[PDB]
Amino acid sequence: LLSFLQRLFRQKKQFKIAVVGLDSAGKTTMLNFLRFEKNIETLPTIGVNVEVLKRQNVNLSIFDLGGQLHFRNLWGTLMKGSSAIIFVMDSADRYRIEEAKNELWKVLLDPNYPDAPLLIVANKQDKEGAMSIQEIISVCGLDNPEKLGNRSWHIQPTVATTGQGVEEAIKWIVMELDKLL
């Protein structure tokens, strides 16, 4: 299971996969498949300890955007050292899609990691109200990608509750970080 995670484990460096999105998008449900164990990341400047996940040299940092607590410089503090970003959206939630779009663009336009590959996960594709990946790309202003620049990006439909598309989502991230490709 996920044999290709060895493409990260074999490299002599530390990886951090930032997994962000609004609450209830499905981030925890999606990453539960990896069975990574809890790790504590200390942020001495802020004076806060953060519960993250880690297996060997790969750290998964999951964070709800638009929650009760916001970091003023998320990408310079909790997400410092980000190698790749997974932005998870609830594709069935049209009430929150404009907020999700707005949070996605705050990540894309942040100056800390402009070259970190970013995967949009269009989650909850099993629900009757689910937006297509084409509609998500249009609503997000990604049909004509110019503001994104040279950043590698992709969109993957998923059903995190069954695991549909989850292995393919992780594969895209690992492939973008694989020095052998």
What is the contact surface with a second copy in residues (CB under 8 A)?
A: 40, 42, 44-51, 62-64, 67-73, 77
Cβ 43 to a second copy shortest distance, Å: 8
Query: Has 23 been labeled as part of a binding site?
Result: yes
Assigned token pair, 130: 């689910």
- Closest by Cα among 30, 43, 116, 102 to 78: 43
3-state DSSP assignment of residue 42: strand
How many residues touch Mg ion (CB under 5 A)?
A: 2
- Annotated binding-site residue? 27: yes
The CA R_g of the chain, rounded to the nearest whole Å, is: 16
**26 belongs to an annotated ligand binding site:** yes
We find the least distance from the C-beta atom of residue 23 to Mg ion, in angstroms, to be 4
- Is 29 labelled as part of a ligand binding site? yes
Scan residues 20-59 and list those touching Mg ion (CB under 5 A): 23
In the complex, the residues that contact ligand GDP under the rule CB under 6 A are 21, 23-29, 64, 88, 123-124, 126-127, 159-161
Report what 25 binds from a second copy, Mg ion, ligand GDP, none; CB cut-off 5-8 Å by kind: ligand GDP
Distance between CA atoms of residues 155 and 165, nearest Å: 11
Binds 123: which of ligand GDP, Mg ion, a second copy, none (CB < 5-8 Å by kind): ligand GDP
Q: How far is the CB of 13 from ligand GDP (least distance, A)?
A: 27
Spatial distance between the Cα atoms of 80 and 76, rounded to a whole number of angstroms: 5
Q: Report how far residue 29's alpha carbon sits from residue 102's, in angstroms, rounded to the nearest whole number.
A: 23
**Residue 174 DSSP label:** H
8-state DSSP, 76: G
Contact window for Mg ion (CB under 5 A) among 62-70, 74-82, 103-111, 114-122: 62-70
Known binding residue 67? Answer is yes
Of the CA atoms within 13 Å of residue 137, those in its CB half-sphere come to: 14
**By C-alpha distance, which of 174, 176, 154, 156 is closest to 166?**
156
Q: Which residues are annotated as a binding site for GDP?
A: 24-29, 123-124, 126, 160
